[PDB]
Design a protein around this ligand. Structure first.
Ligand SMILES: *[C@@H]1O[C@H](CO)[C@@H](O[C@@H]2O[C@H](CO)[C@@H](O)[C@H](O[C@H]3O[C@H](CO)[C@@H](O)[C@H](O)[C@@H]3O)[C@H]2NC(C)=O)[C@H](O)[C@H]1NC(C)=O
Ligand SMILES: *[C@@H]1O[C@H](CO)[C@@H](O[C@@H]2O[C@H](CO)[C@@H](O)[C@H](O[C@H]3O[C@H](CO)[C@@H](O)[C@H](O)[C@@H]3O)[C@H]2NC(C)=O)[C@H](O)[C@H]1NC(C)=O
Ligand SMILES: *[C@@H]1O[C@H](CO)[C@@H](O[C@@H]2O[C@H](CO)[C@@H](O)[C@H](O[C@H]3O[C@H](CO)[C@@H](O)[C@H](O)[C@@H]3O)[C@H]2NC(C)=O)[C@H](O)[C@H]1NC(C)=O
Ligand SMILES: *[C@@H]1O[C@H](CO)[C@@H](O[C@@H]2O[C@H](CO)[C@@H](O)[C@H](O[C@H]3O[C@H](CO)[C@@H](O)[C@H](O)[C@@H]3O)[C@H]2NC(C)=O)[C@H](O)[C@H]1NC(C)=O
Ligand SMILES: *[C@@H]1O[C@H](CO)[C@@H](O)[C@H](O)[C@H]1NC(C)=O
Ligand SMILES: *[C@@H]1O[C@H](CO)[C@@H](O)[C@H](O)[C@H]1NC(C)=O
Ligand SMILES: [Cl-]
Ligand SMILES: [Cl-]
Lengths: 425, 425
């Protein structure tokens, strides 16, 4: 027969990690791999039908993605949706597909609300999620004996689609469930530097292990202000939640990175102000298969879409789409092998959840709730060179932290500071 | 042929002005009238197909209305929608039907955002709108000479679907558009005895003509507190925006009303505190046809729905559905008379707007933008008896204020107070 895959992604705005400009080559490579293997959907042809998830301004919209999804459903009758990765379109599209009893694959839509599989039935997230970051932090605290309190700051910009709110919301919700700690939210406006005056006043009393989600330049400015306030590393620890490694030139590959230098003259102070800062990012797959997949993905993207893909940590999202589509194809193959049909949403989807799969991004695990178990990396500075590099790795399947190359976290005192001062608040 | 009408309303909650329990008999009477008259759609058959606008909790939600609309569209292929009435359900359905190029009739959804016919194409509102209330006050200020400043308070309550917010938003925007006055928003928590204390402090330094949107009990409490202060009627005038006459036992019929009489023992003070308060409501249709329509609508509702309707101004919302649907049926009758078809949404809608119609609720006018021109009533106290009765009427079509039965507004000072006091704030 013919199996139709319905895609609702940005078709003409090549500025999202899930934009069709960079996800299209991934899906094409996956489908070319399905045809090559006779062990996947024998005697079947997979087809993609495209719908756009953006309004006339060229950005995400929760009012255009549902319309595109409804049009695709009526016209073509797909078997699966390669649904939106965008937090605001993904919600209505997922509600619609849950109503229709159709699976929805996505490597985006990482918000916390999308993981309540009672309202979002049959949806699978093959990419990173924000709640799983809360796991990592927990595994970190147990390691360093921080069991009392924590503070979480997120920045606000008019442009971004409210990214740090969702990131810190997921992190907070999942960390307050697994630890008996007191966690304090806080929001600040990234534009104006007057809020940074209030932030430095209200942070020595409300917390001593801080997690900031602001952008790279905002974080560097805030850290310089903190140094000017005498917030040495002997007391505080600032973790920058930079999931896609934008402050590390993508955070891809073994190279020395200096995220505190801008050639602005004010660098000697910036180096001394990053001695109390660690950076939390997604983890780079470190296998040859991922490198080859990128090598040919960058070529196909240039040829097919006239788009030049830059090296970075945002290619894990196209890789996740590739892996998730292959996993779904395998699940459908098993379903047809056991006397079913491609329209069996429940039997297909429950052969995807709670199992392990081998893809370009390594050996991945889809937990029993339908989301994927994400791995993370912690970057710390070098006392001698002053360059950042990955020091800790976190495997979310086994849920553990590992040192990389016989290099340990660099603390000014030699041990982590207490999350509660000895004679303070 | 067969003309299908798609209904998306509350089919089981029977507690809304537009609930199917009380709108169903109206539609049924309308369709019975269509069959009786050979001058309307000669020969055609009109039939309704029902979908529900509410979730499992029984309340109307923006998540369950679009799903029902999509199901109806795909299963029955309607020619017109009796779209939702709720402000939150009507937006997604309005956008969907604008996309499909299908007309959407409604006597609910009064919010301001629903009137931007660039986004909500082909939608007709046959019932009251909140923006038209901004017209009324504009015609009031001009009459009374207030042309300097105004203050608008609205209450917040967890239960209601943010009603006063939308009401005061529409009033604010439409009065700012067409008056050279400065007007200030304020929100207060209805179930918060401290908020009234903190509001009577900031009211005297923010305006002299106040418009309050809250419940009857909240307004009575606020008026008693104001009298407890020195806020006499020689200085302020408080306008209670009670569109459906909840504080006047429905506000329909010529009977004396005492909205300050609560049987609490705090009535001698309440009467003295309502001498500086006027009440703004919708206008009761004052023709025999409306009375007969109500007489038989109540009977039909009880017979066919096991629901007993209590008289009031809410009964004008079903009547609107009876009028608007008869307007549409006329428009689609003229289209078929000029070589058109029932699926020409644009040609049909152009024959409903900018024209006048004769219905049970009088001679109505649909302005050039597609919203009905609403009429209003102003109620004021009687010095001799203390009862409330309509003193002023407002015709939306002609935009005129008319005195009723030789009654003059009762001002304690003899003339309206100034909107800005001499040597004032
Ligand atoms: C592709 O989509 C992107 C969205 O990622 C559009 O890019 C604009 O991106 C900036 C941030 O990089 C946003 O700030 C901007 O939206 C906001 O901009 C200003 C702040 O400068 C804000 O005040 C506005 O209210 C607005 O919300 C994004 N653009 C828009 C229209 O919002 C980009 O235009 C798209 N490109 C193409 C070719 O379509
Ligand atoms: C993260 O942790 C997992 C384990 O916690 C790492 O390795 C995998 O572990 C599972 C068991 O939990 C192994 O099954 C898997 O290796 C075998 O899986 C299948 C099942 O039989 C087998 O057919 C395969 O050929 C393979 O032998 C482990 N994966 C391997 C060995 O690649 C996982 O690697 C960790 N991730 C990282 C990035 O280190
Ligand atoms: C029919 O729908 C009505 C809604 O109009 C449901 O009635 C409840 O109405 C009250 C106000 O009259 C709402 O407050 C209530 O929703 C709120 O209730 C509490 C307030 O005490 C608030 O704290 C809650 O968060 C909630 O928002 C309405 N009910 C619900 C579930 O919201 C009524 O249940 C419906 N009746 C039937 C028979 O289905
Ligand atoms: C509100 O105002 C309108 C006018 O501003 C009131 O009366 C109607 O006025 C229009 C002209 O603007 C009249 O056309 C209409 O009467 C005739 O309308 C049609 C058109 O020819 C005709 O066929 C009818 O038979 C009727 O003679 C007026 N409506 C009438 C007389 O009922 C309107 O009544 C005002 N509303 C209230 C509640 O007072
Ligand atoms: C998931 O599978 C593992 C074994 O493969 C099993 O132990 C576990 O209970 C499963 N969970 C669910 C929800 O089936
Ligand atoms: C509406 O119709 C009246 C006459 O019937 C006309 O004067 C007015 O210009 C019309 N407006 C529009 C938008 O057609
Ligand atoms: Cl999207
Ligand atoms: Cl509704």
């Amino acid at each position: 027969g013919n199996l139709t895959v319905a895609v609702v992604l940005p078709l003409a705005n090549t500025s999202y990690p899930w934009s069709w400009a960079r996800v299209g080559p991934a899906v094409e490579l996956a489908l070319a791999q399905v045809k090559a293997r006779p062990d996947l959907l024998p005697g079947w042809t997979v087809r993609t039908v495209l719908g756009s998830s953006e309004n006339a301004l060229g950005v995400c919209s929760d009012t255009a993605a549902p319309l595109a999804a409804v049009d695709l459903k009526w016209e073509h009758n797909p078997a699966v949706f390669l649904g939106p990765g965008c937090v605001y379109a993904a919600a209505p599209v997922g509600r619609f597909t849950a109503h229709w009893r159709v699976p929805l694959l996505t490597a985006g839509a990482p918000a916390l609300g999308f993981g309540v599989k009672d309202e979002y039935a049959l949806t699978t997230r093959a990419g990173p999620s924000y709640a799983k970051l809360g796991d990592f932090v927990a595994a970190l605290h147990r390691r360093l004996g921080w069991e009392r309190q924590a503070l979480m700051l997120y920045a606000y910009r008019p442009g971004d689609e409210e990214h740090c709110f969702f990131l810190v919301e997921g992190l907070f919700m999942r960390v307050r469930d697994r630890l008996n700690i007191t966690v304090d939210h806080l929001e600040f406006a990234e534009d104006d530097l007057s809020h940074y005056t209030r932030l430095l006043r209200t942070m020595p009393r409300k917390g001593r292990v801080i997690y900031i989600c602001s952008s790279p330049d905002a974080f560097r400015t805030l850290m310089l202000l903190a140094l000017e306030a005498g917030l040495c590393g002997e007391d505080y620890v600032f973790f920058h939640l930079d999931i896609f490694g934008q402050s590390l030139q993508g955070g891809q590959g073994p190279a020395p990175r200096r995220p505190w230098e801008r050639g602005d003259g004010q660098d000697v102070s910036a180096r001394q102000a990053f001695q109390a800062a660690k950076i939390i990012t997604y983890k780079d797959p470190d296998n040859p298969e991922y490198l080859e997949f990128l090598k040919q993905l960058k070529h196909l993207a240039y040829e097919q879409f006239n788009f030049t893909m830059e090296d970075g940590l945002v290619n894990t999202i196209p890789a996740s789409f590739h892996d998730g589509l292959l996993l779904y194809i395998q699940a459908v193959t098993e379903t047809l092998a056991h006397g079913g049909t491609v329209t069996d949403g429940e039997n297909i989807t429950q052969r995807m959840w709670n199992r392990s799969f081998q893809g370009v991004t390594g050996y991945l695990k889809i937990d029993s709730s339908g989301d994927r178990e994400t791995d993370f990396s912690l970057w710390d500075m070098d006392p001698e060179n002053g360059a950042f590099r990955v020091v800790l790795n976190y495997n979310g399947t086994s849920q553990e932290l590992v040192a990389v190359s016989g290099r340990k976290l660099n603390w000014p005192l030699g041990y982590p500071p207490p999350d509660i001062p000895k004679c303070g608040f």
